[PDB]
């Protein structure tokens, strides 16, 4: 596997978005991953609708602004036969009526692939060979809220009780040794103003810090 990966530099990642006061990070993590896989398949980067997921995926087990999971979103896109674009089904950060329109669909998936739970090397392989990967993490800390730069490491983090969905767009390392000071490159959905231009470097190969490899998946396009 490569010493580092950064899919933002290959055209796979849309600009950072903001979920605002709605518990929809699972929807942004799912649109992030599908944006990457649709780009790998067609060469075209098209922003996807988190609102479509928030309003329409209750049958699959999501609860809109009250929470959800990325695998349930990919299940919704499969069962539904499509997903609309960000442009055509805009984000408003509140639960609304499902207005899915097939004529506006710009993405599809046949299901999803799961990364072995807890296996950071399996996750490294997925990021290197597939593209951006949806993951869950423990973001329940003021150190995360006011994160600004560097490799994030929180002693109080859990690898099992996770509360936020994000997107791993790469991995890397600080310094000349590729085997130390390693990190996961993670795209958040709290706006470009949060963190490091909307991104955070999370400690990698440090016992699955914050659960990044506990519930990772990606859509099959």
């Amino acid at each position: 596997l490569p010493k580092s990966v950064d899919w933002r530099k290959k055209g796979y990642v849309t600009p950072v978005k903001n979920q605002k006061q709605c518990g929809s990070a699972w929807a942004f993590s799912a649109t992030g991953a599908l944006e990457g896989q649709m780009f790998r398949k067609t060469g075209k980067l098209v922003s996807l609708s988190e609102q479509n997921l928030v309003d329409c995926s209750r049958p699959q087990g999501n609860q809109g602004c009250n929470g959800g999971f990325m695998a349930r979103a990919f299940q919704y896109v499969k069962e539904n036969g499509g997903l609309d674009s960000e442009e055509s089904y805009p984000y408003v950060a509140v639960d609304e009526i499902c207005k899915y329109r097939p004529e506006n669909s710009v993405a599809q998936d046949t299901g999803f692939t799961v990364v072995a739970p807890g296996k950071e090397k399996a996750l490294m392989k997925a990021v290197a060979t597939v593209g951006p990967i949806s993951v869950a993490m423990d973001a329940g800390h003021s150190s995360f809220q006011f994160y600004k730069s560097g490799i994030y490491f929180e002693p109080d983090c859990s690898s099992k009780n996770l509360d936020h969905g994000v997107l791993v767009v790469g991995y890397g390392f600080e310094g000349a040794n590729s085997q130390n000071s390693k990190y996961w490159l993670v795209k958040n959905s709290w706006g470009p103003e949060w963190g490091s231009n909307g991104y955070v470097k999370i400690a990698k190969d440090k016992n699955n810090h914050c659960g990044i490899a506990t519930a990772a998946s990606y859509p099959n396009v």
């Binding site: 929809s24 929470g67 996770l162």
Partner: peptide, 4 residues
């Protein structure tokens, strides 16, 4: 509704 777990991940927010």
């Amino acid at each position: 509704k777990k991940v927010l």
